[PDB]
Write a protein that binds this DNA or RNA. Sequence first.
DNA 1: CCACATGGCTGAA
DNA 2: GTTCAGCGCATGTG
Length: 376
Amino acid sequence: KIKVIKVFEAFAGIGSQFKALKNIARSKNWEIQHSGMVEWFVDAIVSYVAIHSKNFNPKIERLDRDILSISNDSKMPISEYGIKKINNTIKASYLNYAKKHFNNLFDIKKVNKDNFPKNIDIFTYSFPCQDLSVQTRSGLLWEIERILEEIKNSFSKEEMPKYLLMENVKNLLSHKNKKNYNTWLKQLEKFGYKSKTYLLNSKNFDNCQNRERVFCLSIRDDYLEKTGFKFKELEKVKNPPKKIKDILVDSSNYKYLNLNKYETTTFRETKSNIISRPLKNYTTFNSENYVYNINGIGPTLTASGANSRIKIETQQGVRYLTPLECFKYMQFDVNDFKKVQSTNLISENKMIYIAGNSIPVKILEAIFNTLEFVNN
DNA sequence: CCACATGGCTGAA
DNA sequence: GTTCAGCGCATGTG
Ligand SMILES: C[S@@+](CC[C@H](N)C(=O)[O-])C[C@H]1O[C@@H](n2cnc3c(N)ncnc32)[C@H](O)[C@@H]1O
């Protein structure tokens, strides 16, 4: 009676999707399987392997000769020299393992109907808002569209992914983006999928973080008929609140910021349950100028900049949320963080970068909890 | 017009 | 090429 769930994660990062599925699997009588993934960012790949691998033993290796389109910064492709620098290192073994054991295809431009797995149960993806425009879609979405088009023609309808899940930032629903987002939804309809859009805040899913994200859950229309699946009203869900203090880690050796030069005010709580106070003459960048109270929720963790440097007031002084606490803030576990840290390949700022790019795990648990599969 | 709220990019080193 | 300290406005609601 156990159901094998084959998952394919496009733009996988550190695998919040895989983590969420593994977290709920027992309660659904599911066994989760990697069908494949697409992730080109070296430090995400390393971290994904660290978190999700079982009995992987890193060692110095030659980089597989076809691992050619990868990136050290997540934005730009690595040079021939950079590839040379990875070749014959422990790091190479992580990338080789992702290829061989997780079927990482690395670059979405290299995914086609000849290497895209058949019979995927859950396909996850995303795209930047620009991709809705010409420069008709572009970039990463054009590639997703191309792949769906290709497999539609070569696969039987039953071999196409049963569910699709997009995650995206809130501005996907802005005035300038929403109509063109709707045309993507039309396109998914043309591919044989019925979809529902959810705007969800992490704070309503057992987290101490204000983080509003857009999700488009799609189900293949014949599978909808077969299962009798109905979309759940997730935007009404409100779980009990959680405070920043609930995730903080005790230490005697934190670094505290010297804020003695800056004038401040009382804390104020906004409608969103964020409790903060400004620092005067600190910077000219508004989002850098706040200190957060640990008895409320915090701001959206970003990969870089002001919202990656989240100042909290504690009895011991004002400090940043640490990389460990940032993993906890995204609802990864302490053990997940320890595994990444133990690679000795990912800097503290890079850890925060990958955490900031991820998705709070319990939002995904809630979405995936609604999925229905036939006993076949 | 106002008050308020909220979340990556890049050039010097 | 990397790294991150320094830096502002876009996109809203009311
Ligand atoms: C915001 S993240 C997604 C993070 C992920 N949802 C997680 O659970 O951590 C977007 C990811 O897409 C990756 N990416 C960008 N361009 C890519 C490409 N051409 N091929 C594969 N991955 C790409 C980036 O490296 C980044 O990790």
